[PDB]
C-alpha cells in the first residue's frame, strides 16, 4: 500500500447518539409510527435494518398503524434500533416481546423471551 | 429490572446501511458533483457535515458542487457510513479539499497530517 488508511473509533458511537438526538427531535423523519394513539417518529432507513418487517412494508412519508402495541414498548425497540441497547422494567418485558415479535427484531425477541422463561 | 446491549448489531447495520447507500434504497439526497450522480441518506450525512446540516433546513434534496473531485466525494460518503477512510496517496488532497468544503474535521485533521508530513 502506502497510502491513507483511518478507522475513526470514535465516530460511530458519537454519530448514534446524534442520529438518536435527531429521532427525538424528529428531525428528517420519514416515517409516523402509531402505536394505539400515540405516535413515533423515525428514520426508514434504520428501521429497515432493524426490522425486516418494516423492510417489507417501506419497500412498496410512511404511514404505519399498530392498535395493540403498547406505546412505551415501541420506545423501547426504537431506542434499541438507534443505540443497539435495549432498557425495560420487569412488567414492560412481557410487551416488548410481542412488539419485537411483531417487527420481526429476533435478536430482542430472544433476549426478551428468555427473560421471562427463565422466571 | 431487564437490559442488554447487542454489540453485533452495530457493526450488521452500518453494513446494512452502507448496503442500502448502494443500492439506491430509501435515499432522499442526491448528491450532484459535475456530473456524478450519487445518493444517501439526509440523516447519515446530517449526521456528518455540518455544511450539509444547515442546507437540508431550507420533494427530496438536491445539491451540487462541480469544484469537487468526485472519487473523493465517493470517500467521504464511505466515511460517514461506515466510520473509515480509505483513500490513495494522489487522491488525499482532493480528500482534503472535499473534507473541508463539508466541514468534516477529523476527515480534515487526518488528511492534512498526512499532506502536511510529505511537503
Redesign the interface.
Known amino acids: 500500500n502506502?497510502?491513507?488508511?483511518?478507522?475513526?473509533?470514535?465516530?460511530?458511537e458519537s454519530?448514534?447518539a446524534?442520529?438518536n438526538a435527531?429521532r427525538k427531535s424528529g428531525?428528517?423523519?420519514?416515517v409516523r409510527l402509531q402505536v394505539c394513539g400515540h405516535e413515533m417518529l423515525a428514520?426508514?432507513?434504520?428501521l429497515?435494518?432493524?426490522s425486516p418487517y418494516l423492510f417489507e412494508i417501506?419497500?412498496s412519508i410512511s404511514h404505519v398503524k399498530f392498535d395493540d402495541l403498547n406505546p412505551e414498548a415501541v420506545e423501547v425497540l426504537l431506542n434499541?434500533a438507534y443505540t443497539?441497547?435495549?432498557?425495560?422494567?420487569?412488567e414492560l418485558?412481557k410487551d416488548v416481546y410481542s412488539a419485537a415479535k411483531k417487527l420481526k427484531m429476533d435478536?430482542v425477541k430472544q433476549?426478551?423471551g428468555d427473560?421471562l422463561l427463565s422466571r
Open positions: 502506502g497510502y491513507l488508511m483511518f478507522e475513526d473509533e470514535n465516530f460511530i454519530s448514534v446524534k442520529l435527531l428531525q428528517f423523519c420519514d428514520h426508514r432507513a434504520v429497515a435494518c432493524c417501506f419497500n434499541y443497539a441497547q435495549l432498557k425495560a422494567d420487569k418485558v435478536r433476549v426478551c427473560y
